[PDB]
Amino acid sequence: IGVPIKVLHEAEGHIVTCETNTGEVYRGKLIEAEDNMNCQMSNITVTYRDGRVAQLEQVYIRGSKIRFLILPDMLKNMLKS
Amino acid sequence: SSKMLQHIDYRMRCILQDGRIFIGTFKAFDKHMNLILCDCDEFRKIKPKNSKQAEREEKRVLGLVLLRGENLVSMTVEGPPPKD
Amino acid sequence: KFTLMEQTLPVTVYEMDFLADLMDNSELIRNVTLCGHLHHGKTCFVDCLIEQTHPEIRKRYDQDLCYTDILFTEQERGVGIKSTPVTVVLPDTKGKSYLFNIMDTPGHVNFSDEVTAGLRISDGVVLFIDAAEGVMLNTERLIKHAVQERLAVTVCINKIDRLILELKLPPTDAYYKLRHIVDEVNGLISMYSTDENLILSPLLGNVCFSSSQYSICFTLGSFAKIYADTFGDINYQEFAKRLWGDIYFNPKTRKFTKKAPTSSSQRSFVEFILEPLYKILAQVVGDVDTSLPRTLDELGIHLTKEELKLNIRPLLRLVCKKFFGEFTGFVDMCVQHIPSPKVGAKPKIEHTYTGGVDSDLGEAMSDCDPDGPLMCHTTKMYSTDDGVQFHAFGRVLSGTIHAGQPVKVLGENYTLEDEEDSQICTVGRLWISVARYHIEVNRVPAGNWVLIEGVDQPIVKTATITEPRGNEEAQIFRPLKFNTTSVIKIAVEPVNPSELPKMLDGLRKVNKSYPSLTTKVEESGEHVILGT
Amino acid sequence: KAHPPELKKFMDKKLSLKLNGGRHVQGILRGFDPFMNLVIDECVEMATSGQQNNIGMVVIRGNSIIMLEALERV
Amino acid sequence: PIMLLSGHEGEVYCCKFHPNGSTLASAGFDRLILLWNVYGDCDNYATLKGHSGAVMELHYNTDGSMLFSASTDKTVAVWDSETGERVKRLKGHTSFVNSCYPARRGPQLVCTGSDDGTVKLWDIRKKAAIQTFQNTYQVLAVTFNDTSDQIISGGIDNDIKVWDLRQNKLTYTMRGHADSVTGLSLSSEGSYLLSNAMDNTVRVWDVRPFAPKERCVKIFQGNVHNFEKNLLRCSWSPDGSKIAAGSADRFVYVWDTTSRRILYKLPGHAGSINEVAFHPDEPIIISASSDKRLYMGEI
Amino acid sequence: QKEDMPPEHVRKIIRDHGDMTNRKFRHDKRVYLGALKYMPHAVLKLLENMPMPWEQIRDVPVLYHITGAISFVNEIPWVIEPVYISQWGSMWIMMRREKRDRRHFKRMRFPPFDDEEPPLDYADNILDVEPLEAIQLELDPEEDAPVLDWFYDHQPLRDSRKYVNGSTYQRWQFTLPMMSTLYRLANQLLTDLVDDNYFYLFDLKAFFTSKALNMAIPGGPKFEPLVRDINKIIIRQPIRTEYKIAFPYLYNNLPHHVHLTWYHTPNVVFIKTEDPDLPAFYFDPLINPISHRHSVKSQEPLPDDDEEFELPEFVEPFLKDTPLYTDNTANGIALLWAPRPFNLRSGRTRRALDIPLVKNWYREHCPAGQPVKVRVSYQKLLKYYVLNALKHRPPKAQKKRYLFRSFKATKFFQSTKLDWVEVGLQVCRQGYNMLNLLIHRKNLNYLHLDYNFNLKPVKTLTTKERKKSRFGNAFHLCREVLRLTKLVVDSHVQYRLGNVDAFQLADGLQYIFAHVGQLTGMYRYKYKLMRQIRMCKDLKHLIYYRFNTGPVGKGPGCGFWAAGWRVWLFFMRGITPLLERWLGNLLARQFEGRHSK
Amino acid sequence: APPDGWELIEPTLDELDQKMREAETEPHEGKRKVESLWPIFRIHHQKTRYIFDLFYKRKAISRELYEYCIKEGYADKNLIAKWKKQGYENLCCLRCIQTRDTNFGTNCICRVPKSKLEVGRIIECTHCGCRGCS
RNA sequence: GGUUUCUCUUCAGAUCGCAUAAAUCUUUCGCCUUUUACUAAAGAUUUCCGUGGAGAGGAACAACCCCAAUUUUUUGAGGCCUUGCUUUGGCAAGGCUA
Ligand SMILES: Nc1nc2c(ncn2[C@@H]2O[C@H](COP(=O)(O)OP(=O)(O)OP(=O)(O)O)[C@@H](O)[C@H]2O)c(=O)[nH]1
Ligand SMILES: [Mg+2]
Numbered sequence A: 001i002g003v004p005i006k007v008l009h010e011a012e013g014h015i016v017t018c019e020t021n022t023g024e025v026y027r028g029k030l031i032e033a034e035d036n037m038n039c040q041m042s043n044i045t046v047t048y049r050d051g052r053v054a055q056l057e058q059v060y061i062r063g064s065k066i067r068f069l070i071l072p073d074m075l076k077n078m079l080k081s
Numbered sequence B: 001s002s003k004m005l006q007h008i009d010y011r012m013r014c015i016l017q018d019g020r021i022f023i024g025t026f027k028a029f030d031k032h033m034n035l036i037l038c039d040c041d042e043f044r045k046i047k048p049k050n051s052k053q054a055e056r057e058e059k060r061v062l063g064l065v066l067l068r069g070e071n072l073v074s075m076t077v078e079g080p081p082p083k084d
Numbered sequence C: 001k002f003t004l005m006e007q008t009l010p011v012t013v014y015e016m017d018f019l020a021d022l023m024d025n026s027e028l029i030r031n032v033t034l035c036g037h038l039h040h041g042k043t044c045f046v047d048c049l050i051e052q053t054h055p056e057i058r059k060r061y062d063q064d065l066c067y068t069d070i071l072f073t074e075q076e077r078g079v080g081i082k083s084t085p086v087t088v089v090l091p092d093t094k095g096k097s098y099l100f101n102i103m104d105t106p107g108h109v110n111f112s113d114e115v116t117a118g119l120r121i122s123d124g125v126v127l128f129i130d131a132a133e134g135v136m137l138n139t140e141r142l143i144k145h146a147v148q149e150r151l152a153v154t155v156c157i158n159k160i161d162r163l164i165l166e167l168k169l170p171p172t173d174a175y176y177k178l179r180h181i182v183d184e185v186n187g188l189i190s191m192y193s194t195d196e197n198l199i200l201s202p203l204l205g206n207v208c209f210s211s212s213q214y215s216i217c218f219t220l221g222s223f224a225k226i227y228a229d230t231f232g233d234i235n236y237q238e239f240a241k242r243l244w245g246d247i248y249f250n251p252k253t254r255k256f257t258k259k260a261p262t263s264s265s266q267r268s269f270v271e272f273i274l275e276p277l278y279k280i281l282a283q284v285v286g287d288v289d290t291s292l293p294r295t296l297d298e299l300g301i302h303l304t305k306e307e308l309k310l311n312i313r314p315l316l317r318l319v320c321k322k323f324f325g326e327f328t329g330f331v332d333m334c335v336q337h338i339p340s341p342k343v344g345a346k347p348k349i350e351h352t353y354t355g356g357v358d359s360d361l362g363e364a365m366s367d368c369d370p371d372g373p374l375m376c377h378t379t380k381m382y383s384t385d386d387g388v389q390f391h392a393f394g395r396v397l398s399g400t401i402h403a404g405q406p407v408k409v410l411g412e413n414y415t416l417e418d419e420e421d422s423q424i425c426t427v428g429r430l431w432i433s434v435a436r437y438h439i440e441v442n443r444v445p446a447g448n449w450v451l452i453e454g455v456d457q458p459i460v461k462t463a464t465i466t467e468p469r470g471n472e473e474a475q476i477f478r479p480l481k482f483n484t485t486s487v488i489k490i491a492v493e494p495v496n497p498s499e500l501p502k503m504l505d506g507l508r509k510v511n512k513s514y515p516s517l518t519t520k521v522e523e524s525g526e527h528v529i530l531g532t
Numbered sequence D: 001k002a003h004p005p006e007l008k009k010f011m012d013k014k015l016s017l018k019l020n021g022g023r024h025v026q027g028i029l030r031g032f033d034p035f036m037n038l039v040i041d042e043c044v045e046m047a048t049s050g051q052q053n054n055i056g057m058v059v060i061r062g063n064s065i066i067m068l069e070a071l072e073r074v
Numbered sequence E: 001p002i003m004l005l006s007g008h009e010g011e012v013y014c015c016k017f018h019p020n021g022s023t024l025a026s027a028g029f030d031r032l033i034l035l036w037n038v039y040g041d042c043d044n045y046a047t048l049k050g051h052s053g054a055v056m057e058l059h060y061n062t063d064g065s066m067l068f069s070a071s072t073d074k075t076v077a078v079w080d081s082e083t084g085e086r087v088k089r090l091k092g093h094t095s096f097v098n099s100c101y102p103a104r105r106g107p108q109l110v111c112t113g114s115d116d117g118t119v120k121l122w123d124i125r126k127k128a129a130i131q132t133f134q135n136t137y138q139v140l141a142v143t144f145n146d147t148s149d150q151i152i153s154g155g156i157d158n159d160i161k162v163w164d165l166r167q168n169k170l171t172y173t174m175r176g177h178a179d180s181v182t183g184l185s186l187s188s189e190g191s192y193l194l195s196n197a198m199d200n201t202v203r204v205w206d207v208r209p210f211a212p213k214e215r216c217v218k219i220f221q222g223n224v225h226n227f228e229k230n231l232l233r234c235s236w237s238p239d240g241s242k243i244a245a246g247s248a249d250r251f252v253y254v255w256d257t258t259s260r261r262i263l264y265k266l267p268g269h270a271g272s273i274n275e276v277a278f279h280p281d282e283p284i285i286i287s288a289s290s291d292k293r294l295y296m297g298e299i
Numbered sequence F: 001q002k003e004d005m006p007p008e009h010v011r012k013i014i015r016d017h018g019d020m021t022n023r024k025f026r027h028d029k030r031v032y033l034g035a036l037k038y039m040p041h042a043v044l045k046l047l048e049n050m051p052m053p054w055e056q057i058r059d060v061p062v063l064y065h066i067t068g069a070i071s072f073v074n075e076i077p078w079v080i081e082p083v084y085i086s087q088w089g090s091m092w093i094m095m096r097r098e099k100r101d102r103r104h105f106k107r108m109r110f111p112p113f114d115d116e117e118p119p120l121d122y123a124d125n126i127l128d129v130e131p132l133e134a135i136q137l138e139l140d141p142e143e144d145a146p147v148l149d150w151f152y153d154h155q156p157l158r159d160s161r162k163y164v165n166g167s168t169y170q171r172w173q174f175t176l177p178m179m180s181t182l183y184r185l186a187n188q189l190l191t192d193l194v195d196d197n198y199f200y201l202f203d204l205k206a207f208f209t210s211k212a213l214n215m216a217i218p219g220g221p222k223f224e225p226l227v228r229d230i231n232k233i234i235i236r237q238p239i240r241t242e243y244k245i246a247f248p249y250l251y252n253n254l255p256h257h258v259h260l261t262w263y264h265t266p267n268v269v270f271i272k273t274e275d276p277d278l279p280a281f282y283f284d285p286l287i288n289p290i291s292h293r294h295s296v297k298s299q300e301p302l303p304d305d306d307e308e309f310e311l312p313e314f315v316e317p318f319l320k321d322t323p324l325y326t327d328n329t330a331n332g333i334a335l336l337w338a339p340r341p342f343n344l345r346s347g348r349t350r351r352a353l354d355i356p357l358v359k360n361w362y363r364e365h366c367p368a369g370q371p372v373k374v375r376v377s378y379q380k381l382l383k384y385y386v387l388n389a390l391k392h393r394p395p396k397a398q399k400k401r402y403l404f405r406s407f408k409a410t411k412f413f414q415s416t417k418l419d420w421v422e423v424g425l426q427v428c429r430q431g432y433n434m435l436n437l438l439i440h441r442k443n444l445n446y447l448h449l450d451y452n453f454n455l456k457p458v459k460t461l462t463t464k465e466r467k468k469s470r471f472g473n474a475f476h477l478c479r480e481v482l483r484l485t486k487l488v489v490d491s492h493v494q495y496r497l498g499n500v501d502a503f504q505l506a507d508g509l510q511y512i513f514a515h516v517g518q519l520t521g522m523y524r525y526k527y528k529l530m531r532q533i534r535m536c537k538d539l540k541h542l543i544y545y546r547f548n549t550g551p552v553g554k555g556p557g558c559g560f561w562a563a564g565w566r567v568w569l570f571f572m573r574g575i576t577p578l579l580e581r582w583l584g585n586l587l588a589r590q591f592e593g594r595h596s597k
Numbered sequence G: 001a002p003p004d005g006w007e008l009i010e011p012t013l014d015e016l017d018q019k020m021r022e023a024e025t026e027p028h029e030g031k032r033k034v035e036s037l038w039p040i041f042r043i044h045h046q047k048t049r050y051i052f053d054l055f056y057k058r059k060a061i062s063r064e065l066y067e068y069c070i071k072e073g074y075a076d077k078n079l080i081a082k083w084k085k086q087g088y089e090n091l092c093c094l095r096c097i098q099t100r101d102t103n104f105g106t107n108c109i110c111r112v113p114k115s116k117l118e119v120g121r122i123i124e125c126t127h128c129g130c131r132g133c134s
Numbered sequence H: 001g002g003u004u005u006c007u008c009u010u011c012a013g014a015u016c017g018c019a020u021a022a023a024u025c026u027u028u029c030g031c032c033u034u035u036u037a038c039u040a041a042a043g044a045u046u047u048c049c050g051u052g053g054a055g056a057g058g059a060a061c062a063a064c065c066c067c068a069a070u071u072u073u074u075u076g077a078g079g080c081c082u083u084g085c086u087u088u089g090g091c092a093a094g095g096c097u098a
Helices: A003-010 C016-025 C042-053 C072-077 C109-120 C137-148 C161-167 C171-192 C220-230 C236-240 C268-272 C276-286 C288-298 C312-324 C328-337 C341-352 C360-367 C497-513 F007-016 F028-036 F039-047 F081-101 F141-148 F176-189 F204-213 F241-246 F329-334 F372-390 F404-408 F420-441 F463-468 F473-496 F502-518 F527-547 F562-591 G006-025 G033-058 G063-071 G077-083
Strands: A015-020 A025-029 A039-047 A053-061 A066-070 B011-016 B021-028 B035-043 B059-067 B072-079 C029-036 C084-091 C097-104 C124-130 C152-158 C207-211 C216-218 C248-250 C255-257 C375-383 C390-398 C400-402 C406-410 C422-426 C430-432 C443-445 C449-453 C463-466 C488-492 C518-521 C527-531 D013-019 D023-029 D039-046 D052-059 D065-070 E014-017 E023-027 E033-037 E044-048 E055-060 E066-071 E075-080 E086-091 E097-102 E110-114 E118-122 E129-134 E139-143 E150-155 E159-164 E170-175 E181-186 E192-197 E201-206 E218-221 E234-236 E242-245 E252-256 E262-266 E273-278 E284-289 E294-298 F059-065 F071-073 F413-419 F447-449 F455-457
Touching (some): A003 B021, A003 B035, B021 B072, C016 C029, C016 C084, C016 C443, C029 C109, C029 C152, C029 C328, C029 C341, C084 C449, C109 C375, C124 C137, C124 C171, C137 C152, C152 C328, C161 C276, C207 C328, C216 C328, C220 C328, C248 C268, C288 C312, C288 F176, C341 C360, C341 C390, C360 C375, C390 C497, C430 C443, C497 C518, E014 E055, E014 E284, E023 E055, E110 E139, E118 E150, E150 E192, E159 E181, E181 E234, E192 E234, E201 E242, E242 E273, E252 E284, F007 F413, F007 G006, F007 G033, F028 F420, F028 F562, F039 F473, F039 F562, F059 F404, F059 F420, F081 F527, F141 F176, F176 F329, F204 F241, F404 F413, F413 F420, F420 F447, F473 F502, F473 F562, F502 F562, G033 G063
Parallel strands (some): C124 C152, C152 C207
Antiparallel strands (some): A015 A025, A025 A039, A053 D065, A066 B059, B011 B072, B035 B059, C248 C255, C375 C463, C406 C463, C430 C449, D013 D065, D023 D039, E023 E033, E033 E044, E055 E066, E075 E086, E118 E129, E201 E218, E234 E242, E252 E262, E273 E284, E284 E294, F447 F455
C-alpha cells in the first residue's frame, strides 16, 4: 500500500490539480481517487500547455497518464514514516 | 533498504522522466517510486549552481508535489531538511 | 456558569481553509433536522458521529458523553429539551466529504418548538426510531410536521442492539420487527403526504440501520461496499438491491432467486446483515477469552493486548468502529435523498418567504447565490455561557453576510407598506456552530447556517435581516406555525414587587430564548406565561 | 487485486473522450472492463480539423484511454 | 564552550570524530552507538544496536561511510553511517575483540586484535579471516600503515610489533614501554606512531624506509594510569602539531608534538579518561571518560 | 528493608511480659505506659482486618515493638470488588440456609471467659487446634469452574500474573465466565435495576430539594428546615407534594436549593435466561407478535436482469466460518446488563469496607407491606444515605502522610507473621496490661479492672477515694472499645477453639455488631454514638427481614456482620484521632504533671 | 499442600517448629531480654539454613519444594538471598548486618573479622548471641 | 530498551474518593435547675480514612521458481518536411510515410 496513494485518497474534499501526460493542468475539488489514481472528479478547470482553456462540470482522469498532482496546503501539517 | 528513507525528510532535486528538476523535502519513497515533496519548487529552464546572470528562473511553485513512479527519472541531494 | 462552551478548538480531521471552501462550494451542503421520538438515539448518535469526527473524543466506556446537548440543566434532566446546532464534514463510500449541518433536536413533547426551529432552517430531516419501542408520539407528529412543512424525510432505525441483546430474537424475527418499523413509517408518511411518494424503502436508500451506543451505522449499500472491500470484486448497487426483499440466495448457482430454493433457507438480508450482526454481538459479549482472537483474525480485525483486556462495552464499541470503519452509510443515504440548499430553497421560499417565490428577491433566493441581496432568516437564538446575552441563529437564504456591516432587521408584524416595524444595527461577528465551540468567520454565503452577534435586541421570536441600502421589496419569511398550541399557564409574582422590571426583563429573555413561550400581562397587572 | 473501473457512475450516459494520438470521440458509455477498456456505443469522432465520423459502437483502448468527461450533469 | 553532552550511561571507551567534522560516533560498555551532530544543537540522531557486548572500539573509514565497531562479543561489525544498519559481521575471534583499524586510501582492509593472542586481518568480502599473528600474549591495540603493508600492534608484551604482510614475519619490534601497551595510532603523514603505556610514558615512533633503528623520537610524561586497568588509546592533531591523551587522572593531557611541553592539562571529567579525539578541521577536542559524559572542548 | 523475625519472637517476649509485675523487668512497665497511647491505632488496625469467614485462619504482617510494648496490624485490606460481592452473596446463601436448617439456633454465650480467667495463649491452644472448617458454600463444579479453584482463598489473586498487578493485589482484570459466576454467587445481594426510573422522586436531586423545601416523600427520609385569594382557585384534583417535588419550580412557590427532576431513562426491555436449551436469541414467549402491517409496499426502479450484471467470484459473507452464537453468550449478554461489580472486566482494587453489598434494598422505594418498624429502618437508611450523598466535597487539600511507615522505619518496632486471633488475644492482653498499669501508676491499689473491661472497686471508696476514682471519657472510651475488641476477638477465639461453630460464629459477630449498645456502654461517655446505635438496630431489623423470609423465622441465627462491622469501623475512623488527642493530653498530665499555672 | 519430597523434610521442619513452640513458651524471668529472644531468632536461623542449604548446597530439595518452603514460610528468603552474597556467608540473622538496629551505627559484633577481634574475644551478637559469623 | 516488585523525595482534587469518618468554632432551636453532654438547623473551618500526579533510588523476570499491453529495470510515441512566431537558436500547427 502506497503512502502517496494514501495521501491522494485523503485528498478528496480538498482542491486537487492534475498535470496530465499531455501537460494540461486541471483544478477541482477531488471526490474519489482509487489506488490506481483514476481520479473521477467534478468541476474541473483545465488549462492546456499552449494557453488554451477548458472546463467541465465533471471529469475523469486515467491513472497511468497522470503527470503530477498538487493539493492545497492542508496536508503539509502523517509524519511518522 | 534505506535507499530513500536515509535522505528522507531532506531536500533533494529529482529530475523527472519528462525532465523537470523538482527540488523539495522528501515526503516518502515507494516500491514503485511513489514520491512526495513538501515545500516544492520545480525547475524547467535551468538548475542554478552559482549562475551569476540568473539562478532561480523557470521555477514553478508546487508545494506539496506528489508524483508516481512512472514519471521518476533521477534523484540527487539538494537541500538540508527544514527545521519546521 | 451555565453552559459548556470551550474556546480551544480541539483536534480535527479536516482543515479550516477547506471548511471555508465547502462553505464557498454551494453543492455539498445538506442542512438536516435530526429529530426522533423521546430517547430514540438522537444525541447519543451524534455522539457517535462526533466521536468518529474528532480523534480525541471517545466514549468514556461507562456512560456515553453527550457532546451535543449544551446545558447543565439538560445533563441533569436526562431528556431532550433543545435543538442543538452542529457542523460536520462527512465523506461517503466514494470518500467525498460533505458539509452536513445537523440540528440535533429534542425528542420530548414540551420541546417540539426547537425541533420546528431547526426544521424552519432546514432542507432535510432524519427521524430516529428505537427498534424496540415502535412508532410513538413524536415519531408520528414530527413526520407529519416535516411533511406539511415540506421537508425531505429520512429514516434511521437505531437501537437494534435492543433487539439482539435484550429481546434476543431470531434474525428473521428482528427482520419482522424491521419491516414492521419501516413499513409503518412509510405508511404514516403516505397518509400525511400528497402525491409525492416519500415511501422509504432501503433499496431506494432512505433508511439507516444503526446502534448509536455501540457504534453501528450503515445502509444496504454501505454493507455491500464493506463486502466489496473484503472481496474486492463485488458491485455496490446491485448487491444492495438484492439485500432487501423476500428474495432467497441459492449458492449451488451462487445466484439470488426470488423463489425460495428449499423449504428451510434464509433470505439475503437475513443471512448477510441480520446474521453477522447477531454473530458479532454474541461472540463479543459471551465467549471472550476462548475463541475471540480467532473471530477477530477471521474478521481481519487487530486489537492490542490493551484492547482485548477491555470491558465488554469498550470491546464491542471498538470492534464496531474497527468493522464498519467510517459512518458513511448515514451520509450516503442523506446525500441520496436530502436536497442541497439549492434544491431545498424553492420549497423553503414557497412556504416561507412571504414576499413571493417568483420575484426579484424570491428568485435571488431560489438561485441562492452568494451575490444576491443579503437575506438572513433568524428563527433561533442561543445565549452565551453566563446567559446574559443571546446570539441570533438561522441560515442564509440570499447573499453573503460579512462582519462589520450594518443591517436592517425586520420582524414578524413588519410589512413593506408600513415601514413601522424595523430596526437598524451593526452585526458584530459571525460563527459556524459546533455544540461546545464556534469557528468565527468573515464572509458567509447563502446555503449555510449562521450564528450572529448583536441583533438579538430587536428580535422577539423570528426575524429577517437585509442590508438597509436598496431592495425595498423584501417581506419577512413566514413566522413559524408550531405543532402544538399554548394552553398551559403560569401566574408569577416576585417576592419583591420593586424588582419587577428585572423579573419582566427575565420573562422577555425567556420569551426570546424558548420559541414556543408566550408572555401575558393580565388585567390585574400580573405576569402570566403561556406554555404547553 | 483486480480492482474494478469506477465507471458505473458515468455508465449508461454519454461522454466526450480523448484517446491517445490526438483522437477525440463522443459516445454513450455502456460498460467497461477490469482493464478499464470500455465499449461505449454511439461513437462519433471529431477529428482535430473537425471531421465528424459516427462509426457506431466500439471499445475504448484502456492503455491508450487518455481522458473521458461526461457530456451531461451527474 | 566545552559542550558537555550526556546520554552515555556507561564507560565510553570510544568517541570518534568524522574526518569531515560533522558527526561523532560514541560507544562503550553501553553496547549502543550514539551518532551525534557537531553543529546545530549538538544533537544525536540515531542509536545503532546489534552488538550484544560492549562496543570496545568505534572507528570510521577514511570515507566515513562505514563505522567499524569492535565489541567484546567476539565481533567486529560494520555499520552503514547513513541509516544505522549493520551490514555484516567479522566473526571468528575466539576471545574479546579489542582493536580495529581501517586501511588508508586503499581497498578496504581491516586490522583487528583480540585477547586470544591473535592479530587478524580482514578483507570484508570474504566473511572470514585471512592472516593471523598469534603474538604470544593477548592483543590490545592494532593499527595499519598508510602503505597498507605493515601492521603495528601494541600488547601487554612491552613490545610494539610491526609485521610485513608479505613475509608474514615480524619485521620491526619497538622496545621502550615498561608496562602493557594499551593503544596506538599512526599519524596522518604515516610517519610517526603515537603509543600509550600504562607505565605512563607516551612514545612517538617513526616508520620510514630508512630508520635510526631506535624510534624513541619523542617521550611525553603525564598520561596517568591507575588500578582501573582500562585500555587507553591516543590521538594526533589534524596537522600533527598536538598530541592528545586520555588517562586515569580525571584530566585530559595535550602535549605539543614538537616541543613535548604539556600545552594543556584539561579538567572536566571526574573519572578515568578513555578516549580524546581531534576535530579534523578546527582545534577542537572530543573527550569521553569513565565519567560517561562527552565534552566538545574548543581551544 | 526490615527483614522478618520469627513469630515465636513476639509470642516469647509477650509471654515474658504476660504480667509486668515480675521485678526483673522494672522498666518495661514505664515502657508500656509510653506504649499505651498508640493503642487506639493498634485497636482500629487490628479490628479493620477481619479474618473473612469464607476462610478458616488468616496470618498477617503486624508492627510490634522490639520490647513487645505494643502491636499494630500492618496490612491494608484490598480485595477484587467482584470477588468481594460474590463471596458475600455466597455467605448470604450459606447463613440463610444454616438458620433454615439448624432446628434450634443456640447463639454464642457472650463473654465466655471469666473476669479472672487469664487469656489463652495461641501457643497454649490455638497454635494446636484444627480450623473447624469454614462457612464455605459449595460451587457447582462445571458452571462455577471459572471461579471454582481460587474463590475462597484469603487474598485470592495477589500472585496472579494474569489477573492482578502484583503482590500489591492492585488493579484486577478477569475473564467473562468468571464474571458471570461471580454475578451468580452474588445474585442475592444484587439489585436487578438497569434504569434510573425507580428513583425518579427518590434520588439525590429530589431529596435535597425536599430537604431545603422541608418537604417529605412517602417512603423517603425527613429532615429539619434549613431555615424555618380563596375565591379564584380552580380545583379538580389536588396540587400534590410529590408533584411539588417532580415539578419543583411551578407548584412550588419560592424555591430554595431546588433540584431539576424528571430524568427519564427508557423503560428497558430485559428478558431473563431460565433454562439452557433456549438459544440465546430466540423469540421469548413474553414478547408480542410483530405483525408488520400497512398499505401497499412500494416500488423502486429495481435493477431488472436481462440488461447485464455478473460478479467475478471470491465473495462470502463477512462471517461465514463463524457460527452465530456460543454457549455462554447468554451469560455474556447478562454481562451487558449487570450491576457495576459484574458489568466489567478490568479495574482497580478497593478496601473491604467501601462495598455496600446491602445498599439498594434499603434504597428500594416501596416495600409495601412490612412492619412500620423495618419500614422506618429503610427510611433511616435513606436518611443517613441522603446525608452522605449531599455531604461529599472533594478532599480539597492533601498531604499523603505515612505513619506506620515512619514507625516501622525505626529500630524500636518490628514486624512478624502470626495468626490474626493470636494478634487479637495479645491485643486484649496488652490492653488490660496498660490499663491496670495506668491504675497502679496512679497508685490505685483500691481499684482494679477485670479482663472483660469492668472497673471493679475493692471497697466502697471514701470521699477522696471515690472522688479520685473518677475517670475521663478518654479512659472510659478506650476501655469500652477495648471491650468491643474483647468481645469480637474472643468470639472468633471461641470459634477457633471449636466451641460453637462457624455459622454460630458469624451469627454471634452479627450479634455484637447489632447489640453493642447492650455490650460496651460508650454512648454514656459520648451521646452522639446513638446515631450509629440507630444504624445498628436498623440494619439488624432489615437483614432479619430478608433473612427470615423462607423457612427461617424470628429466631436467633442471621449471619451477616459485613455492614455493622463496616459502619463500626467508620465510627472508629472518626474517633481514634480525637481519642489519641485526649490520650496524649491525659498522658502529658500524668507524667509532665498538670500545668501548674 | 506442598509438592513431592515433602514427607522427608516435613519431620525435621515440624521438629524445628516444635523448638519454635518451646522458644515461644519459655518465660524471661531474670534473663536478658535479648537472651529471651535469641533462642527464637537462632532456631529460626537454623530452619532457614536447613531449607536454604537443601536448596543451594545439597539441591536435594528442588526449585519446587524450596519455593514451597519459601512461600509457606519454612525458609527465610531474606537470609537465603543474603548468604547468596559475598561477605555475608555465615550470618546469624539480618538484623546483625542491617544498620537500622545499630545505636553506634555499626553492625553486630558477631561479624567482626578474626583479625580485628581481640585474641580470645568471644564474638557476641546482641540480637542472637552468635559466636562469629564472618 | 521491555515487564514486574519495593525505597525515597516533589506536587496535586471548584463536583471525587459511584467510598464516607471526626472535631472546631460561629450563628438559630430546644432538652430545661448548672456545666456539660447534647438537640437539630446553618455558615465555614480544620483533622482523619483513602487518592491523584512527577520524579528519584534498588530488586526480580522475558532480552540483547517464474512474468510484466494504464502508472517505472522488454514497451512498436519512429523520422522528415511546409507554414508560421522568434535577434539566430529555438518554439506552435498539419501532412506523409513503410
Ligand atoms: N441499548 C442501547 N441504548 C442506547 C443506544 N443508543 C443510545 N442509547 C441510550 O438510549 C437513551 C436515549 O438517549 P438519546 O440517545 O440521547 O435519545 P434522543 O433521541 O437523543 O432523545 P432526546 O435527546 O432526549 O430527545 C440514552 O440513555 C442512550 O444512552 C443503543 O444503541 N443501544
Ligand atoms: Mg438527543
